[PDB]
């Protein structure tokens, strides 16, 4: 059995985040290592119980502009892109996103005969695609994509809301 307990619209990263690097940025594309700082995380999005089995599918709506080590680079602007992970509650469980179709980002699990929750996480890392007369790049709030729950092994959603969305909070790149 399943119930929805989280938020439909979700913001990724702190509002007006500031990100900077000492690294050279002469070998483009360059990826800021923002760790898990630019992310959303919530352990309690659906409440599940009684043998219910569920996983997660993810979908990124941004345009693919390249790839880096087996995952897509998504374009925000002509000079700024994103590496995106989606998956289970833990950021370390994040699945490297590629393409614009629904992809399994959490194989799943089943609750025993007790009550628990299904959570999720999303985090991105900024990528410098091309140089710019600024050195300070500014990105506005942008829609990213969605995550839906994936009931499996007989379990069903019914009319319970399955899908939640994500928006990138505006930030600034420095140095
Ligand atoms: C230890 O108690 C419960 O055990 C189950 C099964 O291992 C699971 O760990 C529970 O945590 C949930 O795990 C889900 C998948 O890993 C995750 O989506 C949920 O966010 C977790 N819910 C939590 C931590 O409250 C855990 O309750
Ligand atoms: Ni290095
Ligand atoms: Ni829905």
Author numbering: 1 to 175
Wording from the paper:
F17 and F18 fimbriae are wire-like structures expressed on the surface of enterotoxigenic and septicemic Escherichia coli (ETEC) strains that secrete toxins causing diarrhea in infantile livestock. F17, F18 and type-1 fimbriae are assembled by the chaperone/usher biogenesis pathway and comprise a few thousand copies of a major pilin (F17A, FedA and FimA respectively), several minor pilin proteins and a single two-domain adhesin (TDA) at the tip (F17G, FedF and FimH, respectively). The N-terminal domain of TDAs is a lectin domain, also called receptor-binding domain, because it mediates adherence of fimbriated bacteria to glycoconjugate receptors on host epithelial linings. Amino acid sequence and crystal structure analyses of the lectin domains of F17G, FedF and FimH elucidate a previously unacknowledged basis for strain-dependent glycan binding profiles of E. coli fimbrial adhesins, one that is driven by electrostatic interactions.
Surface Plasmon Resonance (SPR) interaction studies using a newly synthesized GlcNAcβ1-xGal series (x being 2, 3, 4 or 6) and F17G crystal structures in complex with these disaccharides provide insight in the structural basis of the variant-specific binding profiles. The mutation in F17bG of Asn90 to Lys90 in F17aG could be at the basis of this observation, because a sulfate ion, S4, binds Asn90 in F17bG. Variable residue Tyr114/Thr is located near the reducing end of the glycan and faces sulfate ion S1. The F17G lectin domain sequences have been aligned elsewhere, however residue 110 of F17bG has been confirmed in the crystal structure to be a cysteine, not serine, that forms a disulfide bridge with Cys53. Interestingly, the addition of 10 mM GlcNAc-6-sulfate to crystals of F17bG instantly dissolves them.
